[PDB]
Design a protein around this ligand. Structure first.
Ligand SMILES: CC(=O)c1[nH]/c(=N/C(=O)[C@H]2CNCCN2CCC2CCC(F)(F)CC2)sc1-c1cncc(N)c1
Length: 130
């Protein structure tokens, strides 16, 4: 309905604001754009389902997220991809893993503090009804 499309619009507005706050954080710059095959060639050998914050923005605008759970699944994918591609004790690996976990923890903390749980429930019930 009209009421339901207004609900999903507010969700998109909220998700755009969270994603922008993540994307401008210096720690998360490595997660802001897809991985250039020129710069690292073996990424596709390890990571079957790439994800990054620019792609999250595009998915928001394509109405791909109808719940915050759907969005958080892509945030979690960014993080688990980073952990999987950087398993070594190497300090470069450990640094990216630390930033990956910080990215995930920061997104969950913002949503826990700022997203009303009745709003997320409404989104879920609209989605369940389709
Ligand atoms: C998406 C992802 O997880 C990813 N992981 C990578 N891991 C590495 O490059 C590991 C490999 N082992 C040795 C150490 N090295 C890391 C060194 C050094 C750490 C600080 C730094 F700022 F991160 C820059 C890299 S590169 C990479 C990626 C690549 N091209 C574009 C994008 N957007 C992300």
């Amino acid at each position: 309905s009209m009421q339901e499309e207004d609900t999903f619009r507010e969700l998109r507005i909220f998700l755009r604001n969270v994603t922008h706050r993540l994307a401008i954080d210096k720690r998360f710059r490595v997660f802001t754009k897809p991985v250039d095959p020129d710069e690292v060639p073996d990424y596709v050998t390890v990571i079957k389902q790439p994800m990054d914050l620019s792609s999250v923005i595009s998915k928001i605008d394509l109405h791909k997220y109808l719940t915050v759970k759907d969005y958080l699944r892509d945030i979690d994918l960014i993080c688990s991809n980073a952990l999987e591609y950087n398993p070594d004790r190497d300090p470069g690996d450990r640094l990216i893993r630390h930033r990956a976990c910080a990215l995930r923890d920061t997104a969950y903390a913002i949503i826990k503090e700022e997203l009303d749980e009745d709003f997320e429930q409404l989104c879920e019930e609209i989605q369940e009804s389709r």
